[PDB]
Amino acid sequence: KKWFSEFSIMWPGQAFSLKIKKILYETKSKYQNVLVFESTTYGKVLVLDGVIQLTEKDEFAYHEMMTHVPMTVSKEPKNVLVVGGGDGGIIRELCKYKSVENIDICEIDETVIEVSKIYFKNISCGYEDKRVNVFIEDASKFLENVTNTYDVIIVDSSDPIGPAETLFNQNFYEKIYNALKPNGYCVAQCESLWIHVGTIKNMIGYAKKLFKKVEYANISIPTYPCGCIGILCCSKTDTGLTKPNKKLESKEFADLKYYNYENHSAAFKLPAFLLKEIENI
Amino acid sequence: KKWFSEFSIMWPGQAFSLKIKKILYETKSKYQNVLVFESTTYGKVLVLDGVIQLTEKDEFAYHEMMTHVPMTVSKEPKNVLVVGGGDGGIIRELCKYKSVENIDICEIDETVIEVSKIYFKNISCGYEDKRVNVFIEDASKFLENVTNTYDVIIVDSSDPIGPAETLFNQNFYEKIYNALKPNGYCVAQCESLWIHVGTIKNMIGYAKKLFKKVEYANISIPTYPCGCIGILCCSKTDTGLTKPNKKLESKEFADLKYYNYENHSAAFKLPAFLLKEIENI
Ligand SMILES: CSC[C@H]1O[C@@H](n2cnc3c(N)ncnc32)[C@H](O)[C@@H]1O
Ligand SMILES: CSC[C@H]1O[C@@H](n2cnc3c(N)ncnc32)[C@H](O)[C@@H]1O
């Protein structure tokens, strides 16, 4: 059997590999190279431009924290935007909230969406929900054009190399801020604390120039570089996102595999070296 | 340049790799294969039987949590035992406590100790401390023979394949229990929550058969499989190890890079799937 390996200039000198049971699909779409394969131990794996986006074994860790962190802090969220997130993992978690009225998803690459519908049916199942509306568009342009404002915005992007190039700048957080309700929250995928604090520093800096409260949380997920990924958390009130306003006790949240009330707040308890680096921002 | 790769039957179907700047030393000792190399991005790396034991970039995460968790809960610890731990990382952290009177280390493989003294001088520096006493012995036999009892025992072992074979059974936790003071604490390296809950379940089961309070904490560390490792925490009182009794505010702890008062307790906030698996043990 062969092995897939995740090399990148974004994490030089290290690489994570998964044994391949079989390659399921590959293509060059309008924007990126798409790879789907079945791994021997992590289930099916989605890859974009050589970077692991998810695996069936551990995606829940990432999708549950990215979603249920802002959604338990927002009191009655009605309209939620997902930026990127073509696989539908965030949507899957968003749909569990009966009180949500609309879920917009702006994903640049329709291939990702259709690939997920075909090969990742237990992840993309939320596309069947009547509240979900899909826009195939660069979120950079979508956010300039959108007339609605949102309670929660979840930025579930790929990395800064590729189409997500436009989602990691000062201009982009303006657009996020303006597209939010005056008491609105945004969470974004942010680097690993273990590999580039510089990037994390830059993001927090862009966010703090508009947002009253900017926090950073960490998620354990084995198939992202360094075994973890951060959540750039953005609030318009000084109350922030570290503390949930509700508990997910209805039958829809019975299946949660990572998120709970306690680990919500825990995710915000960062290694000493990290706290130190971000303090004078 | 070449790459070092960590393959194992203990985590099949996955592998982590580091680019090699240069190989520094290799040998077959009485017990295991030893590899020291300089990596391109993680500094010097120690490998035993093909398994990464530490790297200069991230070892602090592991050594600080393994040490300062029990040492901030034990009120006036005087005599501490390190099982395994030949690199001296735990000793380095133990030495920061002025109140410690004795530090015994039982390490089976003297080669590891001397290799660390030569190639990892900023990790093994605590061997120069007059309180540190070294026993080259299987901790399985050492614990049967020792006449002293300890306030804290830190089990800083390699994995169950190799000489640490004898440190992962019911008999071994008897010995730990008996070698502890009646209000004594033991922490042990335990699996990754992401790869074998079975092992974790087995360890907690052995510990609970003797110890009043058995807890499990998780540490973020990129160069262990799945990017994390657990601490099997064992207490003789129902109070446990989740809550520190002191704050590390003296100039000796000024250099801490991971541990702090808040993330002590945070480490014990586990993913939902894990809590579920261990509940009826
Ligand atoms: C797999 S989930 C991450 C998604 O982010 C999408 N993405 C990257 N850049 C942008 C952008 N500028 N606008 C919308 N979606 C994007 C990628 O196509 C990917 O499907
Ligand atoms: C590198 S720190 C981990 C150490 O645990 C040591 N070790 C493994 N098994 C045993 C044992 N039975 N007794 C003492 N030390 C051990 C290994 O030699 C290694 O140096």
- Protein residue whose Cα sits closest to atom 20 of ligand 1: A86
A271–B256 CB contact, under 8 Å: no
Q: Of the residues A58, A138, A156, A159, which is catalytic? A: A156
B183 touches chain A (CB under 8 A): no
**SS3 per residue for chain A:** CCEEEECCCCCCCEEEEEEEEEEEEEEECCCCEEEEEEECCCCEEEEECCEEEEECCCHHHHHHHHHHHHHHHCCCCCEEEEEECCCCHHHHHHCCCCCCCEEEEEECCHHHHHHHHHHCCCCCHHHHCCCEEEEECCHHHHHHHCCCCEEEEEEECCCCCCHHHHHCCHHHHHHHHHCEEEEEEEEEEECCCCCCHHHHHHHHHHHHCCCCEEEEEEEECCCCHHHEEEEEEEECCCCCCCCCCCCCCCHHHCCCCCCCHHHHHHCCCCCHHHHHHHCCC
Residues 70-109 of A with CB under 8 A from B: none
- Does residue B215's CB lie within 6 angstroms of at least one atom of ligand 2? no
Q: Structure tokens of A157?
A: 């992007």
Technique behind this structure? X-ray
Dihedral, CA of residue A155, residue A153, residue A273 and residue B35, to nearest 10: -30
Please check whether residues A36 and A174 belong to one and the same domain: no
Report the CATH number at residue B36. Answer: 2.30.140.10
Resolution in A: 2.0
Q: Tell me whether residue B156 is annotated as binding.
A: yes
B258–A273 CB contact, under 8 Å: yes
- Does residue A86's CB lie within 6 angstroms of at least one atom of ligand 1? yes
- Does residue A143's CB lie within 6 angstroms of at least one atom of ligand 1? no
Please check whether residues A9 and A117 belong to one and the same domain: no
Report the CATH number at residue A124. Answer: 3.40.50.150
**Which chain B positions have a beta carbon within 8 Å of A220's beta carbon?**
193-194, 218, 220, 227-228, 271
Please check whether residues B114 and B46 belong to one and the same domain: no
A215 touches chain B (CB under 8 A): no
- Protein residue whose Cα sits closest to atom 7 of ligand 1: A84
Please check whether residues A202 and A224 belong to one and the same domain: yes
Please check whether residues A90 and A105 belong to one and the same domain: yes
Please check whether residues A73 and A51 belong to one and the same domain: no
**Which chain A positions have a beta carbon within 8 Å of B222's beta carbon?**
14, 192, 194-195, 225-228
Among the partner-chain residues A14, A222, A269, the one whose CB lies closest to the CB of B263 is A269
Domain count, chain B: 2
Residue B57 C-alpha, separation from nearest chain A C-alpha, in angstroms: 9
Rounded to whole angstroms, the Cα distance separating B268 from B281 reads 17
B8 touches chain A (CB under 8 A): no
Among the partner-chain residues B16, B225, B266, the one whose CB lies closest to the CB of A269 is B266
Which of B14, B17, B22 to mutate: most A Cβ within 10 Å? B14
A17–B19 CB contact, under 8 Å: no
Please check whether residues A49 and A66 belong to one and the same domain: no
Please check whether residues A66 and A168 belong to one and the same domain: yes
Q: Which residues of B belong to the active site?
A: 156
The DSSP bridge pattern shows strands A44-48 and A33-39 to be: antiparallel
Which of B220, B243, B259 to mutate: most A Cβ within 10 Å? B220
B260–A273 CB contact, under 8 Å: no
A263–B257 CB contact, under 8 Å: no
Instruction: Considering every ligand atom shown, identify the ligand nearest to the alpha carbon of residue A169 and give its number.
Output: 1
Q: Which domain holds residue B191?
A: 58-281
Please check whether residues A47 and A82 belong to one and the same domain: no
Q: Structure tokens of B208?
A: 């609970």
Rounded to whole angstroms, the Cα distance separating B69 from B217 reads 10
Q: Which residue in B257, B264, B278, B221 sits closest to B68, CA to CA?
A: B264
Residue B77 C-alpha, separation from nearest chain A C-alpha, in angstroms: 24
Please check whether residues B11 and B130 belong to one and the same domain: no
Range list of H helices, chain B: 59-73, 89-94, 110-119, 139-145, 170-178, 197-208, 261-266, 272-278
Of B20, B36, B57, which residue constitutes the final position of a domain?
Answer: B57
For residue B21, give the DSSP letter. Answer: E
Please check whether residues A82 and A148 belong to one and the same domain: yes
**CA triplet B119, B122, B124: central angle to 5 degrees?**
70
Task: State in Å: Cα B190 to ligand 2 middle.
Answer: 14
Please check whether residues B32 and B66 belong to one and the same domain: no
| Half-sphere CA count of A147, side-chain side, radius 13 A | 0
For tokens 């993680």, the residue is B42
